[PDB]
Amino acid sequence: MVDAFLGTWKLVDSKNFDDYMKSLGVGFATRQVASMTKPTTIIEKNGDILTLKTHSTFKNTEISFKLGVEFDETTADDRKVKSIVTLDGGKLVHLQKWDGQETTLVRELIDGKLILTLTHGTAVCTRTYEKEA
Ligand SMILES: CCCCCCCC(=O)O
C-alpha cells in the first residue's frame, strides 16, 4: 500500500519553496542556502514502520512512524510538531500541527516521479523527485 513510494529519490524541480519557507518564518540566509540544495529522500519500511530520511549538504532529518499513529517530530527548521502520516487517495499525506498551526506535506506518484506538495498558510510549493536506481 506504500510500496511504490519506497526507495531513494533525488530533487529535480522545485516551485515556490521560498514562499513556503518564508511562511514558516525561516530566515533569509537559511532560505538562500535551501534554495540551492537538492536533497535526497530515502523512504524505507520494516513491517509497519516507515523511516523517511532527508539528506543534503545543508541539513539532514530522519523520522520513523507507523501510518495512522501520531508521533512527535522536530522539523528541519526546528519546529516541535505533532505529526501523522496516512495514505489518502493513494497519496502519502503528512500533517504537522503546532501552536494551532498546520502544514501538510503530500506525496504522490505521477509518470514515476514523486511529487511533494507543501502547503502552509496560502503558500503552496511543489517539489519533484526522481528515483535513484
Ligand atoms: C525546512 C522546511 C521544512 C521541510 C522541507 C521539506 C522539503 C523536502 O523534503 O524537499
All structural domains of the chain with their residue ranges: 7-132
Asked if residues 131 and 115 have their Cβ atoms less than 8 Å apart, the reply is no
Q: Which residues on neighbouring strands pair with residue 41, listed in sequence order?
A: 9, 54
C-alpha cell at 100: 494551532
C-beta of 75 in contact with ligand 1 (< 6 A): yes
Tell me 4's DSSP state.
Answer: G
Taking the alpha carbons at both ends of the chain, their separation in whole angstroms is: 21
Tell me 58's DSSP state.
Answer: S
Chain breaks in the chain (C to N over 2.5 A) after: none
> CA-CA distances (angstroms) from residue 57 to 21, 25, 34, 77?
18, 21, 9, 15
Amino acid identity of 11? L
CATH number of 7-132: 2.40.128.20
What is the rounded distance in angstroms from the CA atom of residue 35 to the CA atom of residue 22?
A: 12
Out of 53, 54, 78, 104, give the residue to mutate to test ligand 1, the one with the largest number of ligand atoms within 8 Å of its CB: 54
What is the rounded distance in angstroms from the CA atom of residue 52 to the CA atom of residue 15?
A: 22
Asked if residues 130 and 12 have their Cβ atoms less than 8 Å apart, the reply is yes
Ligand 1 center–CA 54 separation, angstroms: 8
What is the rounded distance in angstroms from the CA atom of residue 51 to the CA atom of residue 127?
A: 20
> CA-CA distances (angstroms) from residue 115 to 74, 84, 94?
23, 19, 13
Which parts of the chain fold into alpha helices (H)? Answer: 17-23, 28-35
Asked if residues 105 and 118 have their Cβ atoms less than 8 Å apart, the reply is yes
Tell me 56's DSSP state.
Answer: -
Residues annotated as binding site for hexadecanoate? 127-129
- Experimentally, the structure was elucidated by X-ray
C-alpha cell at 85: 502520516
